[PDB]
Symmetry: C3
Subunit: 145 residues, 3 copies
């Protein structure tokens, strides 16, 4: 999956960024079974004051998580993943839950590419990884914390 995380510039230190990204990555892995290295967290930082709620300009506490996933998972599983991302990002950023928005969008895996390769269906991460070439597997393995 890709998680776009929109935050206010300098609201998260490098450490907080690391922690929030490990929080989402672990949640995704623990609930879906997708390998760690298939989960991308991409921080989009903007100047604080670039976020309006009901027209009211915000300080710098709002986090928006747009998660882009393969289709095929249940409403239930996705609900549990969204709630775990709320809880865990709240703890990682030290930001109260009222500031956290999370949207999940899904697409057919056949129109989804990661590391230059088309993704498999959600059950099939193991076979797929096993059939990649050697150097591709090697590159992927180093993106695990």
């Amino acid at each position: 999956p890709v998680y776009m995380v929109y935050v206010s510039q300098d609201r998260l230190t490098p450490s907080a960024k690391h922690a929030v990204a490990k929080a989402i990555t672990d949640a995704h892995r623990g609930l879906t079974g997708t390998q760690h290295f298939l989960a991308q967290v991409n921080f989009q930082e903007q100047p604080a004051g670039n976020v309006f709620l009901g027209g009211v300009q915000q300080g710098g506490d709002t986090i928006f998580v747009h998660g882009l996933h393969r289709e095929g998972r249940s409403a239930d599983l996705k609900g549990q993943l969204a709630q775990r991302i709320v809880d865990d990002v709240s703890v990682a950023a030290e930001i109260d839950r009222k500031h956290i928005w999370v949207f999940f969008g899904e697409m057919p895996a056949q129109q989804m590419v990661e590391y230059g390769r088309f993704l498999p269906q959600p059950g099939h991460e193991g076979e797929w990884f096993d059939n990649l070439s050697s150097d591709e597997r090697a590159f992927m393995e180093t993106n695990v914390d």
Copy 2:
């Protein structure tokens, strides 16, 4: 909902940003009944020359709106909404309608979380808002303009 608003850096002044956020939030609340405080506008500024049309680099005047909605509204409604957003953003930004692009994407409300809570179906935000923790109503109420 969330409206991602991609603009060139230093194209919209803070007052023009406020104006545009208003125009959008007004459009959404007017045409859907969704309470003012559930609509985020999130400005994403890039340096001019980061937008290409047909391979031709642009100046600083393109505006692209990406609206992220709950599923369940009619296409007639959605067309009316996209048209009003074009009109009112064109006026509030003093930008010609030929520079404005607007895409709506939709998701099940069961996988959309705002203020740390799961969103209702599009007609039912009243009873959703009533049944909430007193402090959550209190915070939500402040983000209205």
Copy 3:
């Protein structure tokens, strides 16, 4: 279509941005028939180390391409399109494919707006251009490379 391209600041020179936008645009045109000037490439830059893969901060190499299309094309065509953007962006940015990620999302054309007009269905672009005003046609014609 709108292709959102998430890259790191300093990664692509101006000349490389041009070459990448050109390759994406020529791929979309050559495989779907949509006129050049309808294709937007929007580069979003963030400082290096904003991307995490599997919880491990990356340098500045990864390229994420989020293409927003209208519905109604085959999975065969979308697979060819994604693979060709991978190949032509890898060549044009002189980046290895293992850094390239590509997601296609689709929406009904009735909720999509380019140059302030509503898009047609994917093969009716000719009649659609032939019912636009003179000045709109001229403005769109200047966006061809």
